[PDB]
Amino acid sequence: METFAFQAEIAQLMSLIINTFYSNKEIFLRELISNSSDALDKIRYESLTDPSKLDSGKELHINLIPNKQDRTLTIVDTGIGMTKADLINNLGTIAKSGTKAFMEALQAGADISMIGQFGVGFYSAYLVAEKVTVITKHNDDEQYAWESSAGGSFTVRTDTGEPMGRGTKVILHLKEDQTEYLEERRIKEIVKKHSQFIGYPITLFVE
Numbered sequence: 050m051e052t053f054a055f056q057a058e059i060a061q062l063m064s065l066i067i068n069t070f071y072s073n074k075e076i077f078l079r080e081l082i083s084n085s086s087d088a089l090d091k092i093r094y095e096s097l098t099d100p101s102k103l104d105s106g107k108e109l110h111i112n113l114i115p116n117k118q119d120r121t122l123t124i125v126d127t128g129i130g131m132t133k134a135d136l137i138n139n140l141g142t143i144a145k146s147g148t149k150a151f152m153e154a155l156q157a158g159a160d161i162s163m164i165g166q167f168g169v170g171f172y173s174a175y176l177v178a179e180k181v182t183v184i185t186k187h188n189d190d191e192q193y194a195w196e197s198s199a200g201g202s203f204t205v206r207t208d209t210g211e212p213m214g215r216g217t218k219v220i221l222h223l224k225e226d227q228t229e230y231l232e233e234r235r236i237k238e239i240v241k242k243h244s245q246f247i248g249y250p251i252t253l254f255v256e
């Protein structure tokens with residue numbers, strides 16, 4: 050397990066999201082399902098030139114898994130996945146410019162709900178989660194676990210868990226006052242309103 054520091058602005062945005070009074074928190078799901086669809090679009094497109102890219106799994110789907118006992122909501126996809134370089138360096142480059150523009154826009158009057166237009170919709174997870182664990186597997190790298198409770202740092206380690214084949218698991222360890230996102234009725238209602246036309250099957254698991 051390696052520990053990394055976020056740059057001042059990104060830690061400032063994460064703190065903005067984790068704190069700040071904003072009631073419309075449900076938009077986090079739309080954002081993560083959108084990141085999942087983007088990842089599925091990427092692997093599917095890559096496979097068009099190289100079909101061996103789907104040897105790691107052919108099914109292209111999104112699963113939404115609530116767990117009342119662990120107080121978690123997992124968003125699972127079988128997309129492109131992320132390499133160690135992505136988790137540490139490349140996505141850090143994306144998160145830097147995107148944070149700058151979103152912070153500029155927020156000051157100018159833009160809403161927290163517009164986060165996805167700046168390519169940092171992933172951080173909207175912190176509207177409902179006190180900790181986010183990302184389990185991911187790209188064809189070109191090993192299975193990794195990324196994790197942050199915000200607070201200015203994140204960790205990356207090789208993941209010893211169940212092999213995923215290919216894709217991403219975004220585990221949301223929800224805040225104690227955000228357990229409504231564990232209810233079937235609530236998740237269904239959010240999926241219909243914001244994510245009804247995603248081009249991949251979304252299965253809402255139950256308990």
Ligand SMILES: O=C(N[C@@H]1c2ccccc2-c2c(-c3cnc4ccccc4c3)cccc21)c1c(Br)cnc2[nH]cnc12
Pocket residue numbers: 055056059081084085088126128129130131135136137138140141142143144168169171183195217219
């Ligand atoms: O959205 C995706 N990734 C996320 C994303 C988007 C934009 C900017 C950063 C990140 C990020 C970081 C991160 C965040 N901040 C950082 C800041 C500094 C350094 C490294 C950092 C790393 C860590 C884990 C996951 C993601 C994503 C991808 Br792609 C592929 N398949 C998926 N399926 C579902 N989601 C995804």
